[PDB]
């Protein structure tokens, strides 16, 4: 977040074009949290 936030203000682009990036970054949080249970419980025994 802090890398793309400092990069967008270097080119002083829109508030909406920067927040819609950061709403997408923590949408990847929500999609990661739903699949992180099934990787560490069921993919981890397959690699074992």
């Amino acid at each position: 977040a802090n890398v793309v936030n400092e990069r967008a203000v270097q080119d002083d682009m829109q508030k909406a074009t920067r927040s819609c990036t950061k709403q997408w970054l923590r949408h990847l949080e929500t999609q990661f949290d739903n699949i992180a249970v099934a990787h560490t419980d069921h993919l981890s025994v397959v690699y074992a």
Binding site: V3, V4, T21, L28, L43, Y47
Partner: protein
């Protein structure tokens, strides 16, 4: 939507199998043609 491809099962299962397989021919990367122009090009960084 440029980076993300359709969910083909014959290459997702191939990616899991490469992790604990031996390597006899040295692997190389599919060429990613990006310029990192815009702050929206952080998708390729999150891909890595």
């Amino acid at each position: 939507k440029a980076r993300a491809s359709e969910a083909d099962i014959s290459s997702i299962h191939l990616a899991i199998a490469r992790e604990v397989s031996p390597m006899f021919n040295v692997h190389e990367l599919k060429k990613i043609a990006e310029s990192f122009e815009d702050p929206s090009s952080i998708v390729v960084v999150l891909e890595f």
